[PDB]
Structure 1
Amino acid sequence: RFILEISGDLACFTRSELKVERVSYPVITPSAARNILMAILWKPAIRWKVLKIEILKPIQWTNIRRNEVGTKMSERSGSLYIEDNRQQRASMLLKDVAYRIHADFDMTSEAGESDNYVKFAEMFKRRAKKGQYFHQPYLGCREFPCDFRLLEKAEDGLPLEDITQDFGFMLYDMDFSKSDPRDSNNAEPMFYQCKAVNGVITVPP
């Protein structure tokens, strides 16, 4: 288990419902929490698994309308001209977040030869303490960086001390099981937070 300690000035774990008008999930999504732990280290042998988020700064919001673009980019049309494809996505962002994601991982079917769980474990451990990553972890949106740390047990004060808000059914981790290589056909599994007692435990599927 790794008690990595994602933190950042802003964060947007955009609720699936309020995607066009981004309203962040009140805490780190276990998908966004996990994909962060793939940004620091991943390989198609490691399969990350968030075991317990722990909120470390209170759920505080700042709305940010960004002139986002409306349409994907495409081989077909060789430019956007944003002023033609403009959209103004509001973003109820999570200001001053922090999350100590108690996450571990497993070995996939394609673990390869060097399937050593300890190898990837210490690889990620060195990456996180050193600060290395494949990708500066995205707090839900890459516009938001995860000023992370690989805590050992506990090195920050979690604010939802007494029993606190149950954020309801949050996106857990989009189901890339039916997908071929590179996540084509997925689905969304979702979870009762369970509550936020003081740091939400997640459910392994």
Structure 2
Amino acid sequence: RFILEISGDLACFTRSELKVERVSYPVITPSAARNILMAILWKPAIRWKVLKIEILKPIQWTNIRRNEVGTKMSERSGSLYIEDNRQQRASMLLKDVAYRIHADFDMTSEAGESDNYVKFAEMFKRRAKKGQYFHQPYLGCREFPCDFRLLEKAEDGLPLEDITQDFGFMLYDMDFSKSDPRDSNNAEPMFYQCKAVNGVITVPP
């Protein structure tokens, strides 16, 4: 039961619905936390089951428009020439957030012989305290950094002490099951934030 503490000046967990103009989910998506814990350590043998995301900073939205482009980078086209393909995307980011993501990994079927739960456990522990990662944990949008450190039990005050804002259904680990190696397709498996009592009790499927 690893206890990573995401922290970042500025977070953006785009709501699926208003993805076009970022509404960053009020908290981190268990899908995002999944990807961060992948970022610290993900060999294909491990799927990160996120146990308990805890809010560590009060939800503080801040709005910024990134004068963003809106055509995926297409092979055949020679360049994107943004000025033609421009879409000023607004964003209701989260600002200065930290998340105590009580988390775990499970061994995938693609475990291999060298697949000790303790092996990857220790490896991730080292990657965290040593502050390693595959990619600097993207805090909802890789343009926004993360500052992680494997806490042991509890080393940051959590703001939403009393039972706080039900954020409604949001994005869980966006299912890769229907996909071949490296997520060809998917199905966004919405879950419920039912009671962010203090730390949202992310439910495994």
Where on the TM-score scale, by shorter chain, does this alignment land: which range?
over 0.9
C-alpha deviation, 1:143, in angstroms: 1.0
Are the counterparts in 2 of residues 194 and 202 from structure 1 also a CA contact under 8 Å?
no
The 1-side partners of 2:46 and 2:94 are apart by 29
> Which aligned segments of 4 or more residues in structure 1 are displaced greater than 6 angstroms?
none
The 1-side partners of 2:185 and 2:62 are apart by 33
> Structure 1: any 5+ residue segments left out of the alignment?
none
Q: Secondary structure at the match of 1:111?
A: coil
Q: Secondary structure at the match of 2:35?
A: helix
Q: Deviations over 1:130-184 (max 9, x none)?
A: 0000100001001111111100000000000111111000111100001001101
The 1-side partners of 2:45 and 2:108 are apart by 5
Structure 1 or 2: more strand by fraction = 2
Q: Secondary structure at the match of 1:141?
A: coil
The 1-side partners of 2:154 and 2:194 are apart by 21
CA RMSD of aligned residues (A): 0.6
Q: Secondary structure at the match of 1:53?
A: strand
The 2-side partners of 1:178 and 1:163 are apart by 36
Q: Deviations over 1:73-115 (max 9, x none)?
A: 1111020010000011101000010001000010111101101
C-alpha deviation, 1:64, in angstroms: 0.5
**Structure 2 residue 93 is the aligned partner of structure 1 residue 93:** yes
The 2-side partners of 1:37 and 1:134 are apart by 10
Are the counterparts in 2 of residues 61 and 93 from structure 1 also a CA contact under 8 Å?
yes
**Structure 2 residue 190 is the aligned partner of structure 1 residue 177:** no
The 2-side partners of 1:93 and 1:47 are apart by 27
Are the counterparts in 2 of residues 67 and 89 from structure 1 also a CA contact under 8 Å?
yes
Q: Secondary structure at the match of 1:127?
A: helix
Are the counterparts in 2 of residues 51 and 202 from structure 1 also a CA contact under 8 Å?
yes
Q: Deviations over 1:105-126 (max 9, x none)?
A: 1011110110101000100000
Q: Deviations over 1:11-44 (max 9, x none)?
A: 0000001101001000000000110000000011
Percent sequence identity over matched residues?
Answer: 100
The 1-side partners of 2:149 and 2:125 are apart by 10
> Structure 2: any 5+ residue segments left out of the alignment?
none
C-alpha deviation, 1:194, in angstroms: 2.0
Are the counterparts in 2 of residues 23 and 92 from structure 1 also a CA contact under 8 Å?
yes
Are the counterparts in 2 of residues 168 and 195 from structure 1 also a CA contact under 8 Å?
no
C-alpha deviation, 1:185, in angstroms: 1.2
Q: What TM-score, normalized by structure 1, do the two folds share? A: 0.99
